[PDB]
Design a protein around this nucleic acid. Sequence first.
DNA 1: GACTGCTTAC
DNA 2: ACACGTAAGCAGTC
Length: 567
Amino acid sequence: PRKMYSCAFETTTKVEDCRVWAYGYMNIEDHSEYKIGNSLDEFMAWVLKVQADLYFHNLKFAGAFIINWLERNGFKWSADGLPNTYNTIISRMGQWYMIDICLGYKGKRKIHTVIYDSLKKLPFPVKKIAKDFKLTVLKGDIDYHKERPVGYKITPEEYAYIKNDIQIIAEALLIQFKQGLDRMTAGSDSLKGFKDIITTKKFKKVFPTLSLGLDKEVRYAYRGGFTWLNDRFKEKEIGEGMVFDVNSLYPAQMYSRLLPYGEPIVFEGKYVWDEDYPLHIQHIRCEFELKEGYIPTIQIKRSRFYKGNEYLKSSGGEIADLWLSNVDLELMKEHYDLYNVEYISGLKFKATTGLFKDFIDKWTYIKTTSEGAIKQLAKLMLNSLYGKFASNPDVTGKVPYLKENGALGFRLGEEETKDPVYTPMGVFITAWARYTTITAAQACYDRIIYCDTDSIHLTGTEIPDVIKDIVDPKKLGYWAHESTFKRAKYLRQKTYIQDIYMKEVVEGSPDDYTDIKFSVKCAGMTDKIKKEVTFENFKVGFSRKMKPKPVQVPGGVVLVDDTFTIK
DNA sequence: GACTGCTTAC
DNA sequence: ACACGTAAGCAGTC
Ligand SMILES: Nc1nc2c(ncn2[C@H]2C[C@H](O)[C@@H](COP(=O)(O)OP(=O)(O)OP(=O)(O)O)O2)c(=O)[nH]1
Ligand SMILES: [Mg+2]
Ligand SMILES: [Mn+2]
């Protein structure tokens, strides 16, 4: 059995002088076996000898320093596991999962140390993990702005902080390990846990591995959340209003909607109703016009004729070439007049409900009876199961290298593909979610300001009748009354501000409130820049050079300030 | 445009 | 083989 260590670095912040000044490691199963020191050389000597599993919190950061050292001390990158090489799992999106450092083989047994990201299991800051896992946490922080020359000696206080940090993570990881949550990521524990419940034999039967060609066809119909701002309210100062948000929307669809399973049947032309294959994806070419009084529902991506984020009123004289689930197509027919519809071909599926019951019951109970990180973890188990079913087969990743200037660079690796999980489930989970949210928005047409995926933002403070019997703060698939606001302003998708009514005892109301809480929502905008925002300055053209940007420099990674501009 | 390489809102 | 998802976005290179 391989030993497991919780590890951390403390690093300098200068582009011209980027290095580790402190490191710590601690045996997760024996806290007495730990060590803190001021030399990366000393840490990496231990790394190469220990032949164990290491965890850093935010491997993307520490990993840069580790790979900088490896490239300087005779290691090259290799997928083959050759002596004096290292392998990585770094995704196309720049997510770090693994560094596997190989010293060679004794016979057929690999001599290696593997380094994982604890952030993939526990995606919270260390102090938040301590608070919600109820672990010991020291008050205060290391001063990162302090000058620290090579050989700088670690103070007793700094020592205690490093030791605390690695112990918090060690303790939290062990809590999860002893629960059987032992995979390298939350998502991986999620899919495995679901397979444990239904059995692997049943998984294979009910969710067969589709061919890459068929999977690709299915994925044409795979889309995400309905995120939409009503033109009527775009960039206007709004008065009183409210937000409702579905409790676990996608898991609620998984729980109760008609969903596909098994091998699809290919058909040509228009789908013909088949009660045993009641779900389908249809390939069409058509033109369309939005019906008066209906919310637009069609957005077209990867087309030279359309803005991909724009919900379309009209096909505008071009032919829309679409692969659509039956859920989407019926919603399209409800909201649009369709013209010159060419039904080309498609795929039909067997379907049933309840395939995720026990799994959803388990994690919902945990979600409903927990708070903070624990609640958020339960939420992630539910949502990552959906994600795992729609896992892209393309697992091509990034290959690190040391460039001439001594900083790490990356190149796109060789094409790698893995088996599809079950992409039709992904297609229909999101289609039903879109249906749920859009049906509610449409029933609130007179008051609807904005939707993002599973929310409705409404003018006025009275609960609409369409959801009045299904408002609840926790219950699966019910609408939580998220907030009531005194005023708001919506510039564009995922970009809005609200003055929310609050009460001290939490969410408040126009009659009973003690405080007004200014809330900024803006995709891309980081926390310090949000603190700059006011009702007055929140507008297209707003810009602040205060967005931290991680930059590869010689020795590792530093944060430098970049701009964020509302363009 | 494609691409790299980051963010937050779901 | 390991490795949850789309969406909307900003700031760059070539
Ligand atoms: N695959 C995946 N989907 C997510 C994730 N976060 C949100 N989503 C999708 C699925 C969610 O049901 C949906 C709406 O997000 P919310 O933030 O409202 O979470 P949800 O509604 O699940 O729970 P809550 O509203 O917190 O009770 O967006 C994620 O981390 N992974
Ligand atoms: Mg939501
Ligand atoms: Mn929700």
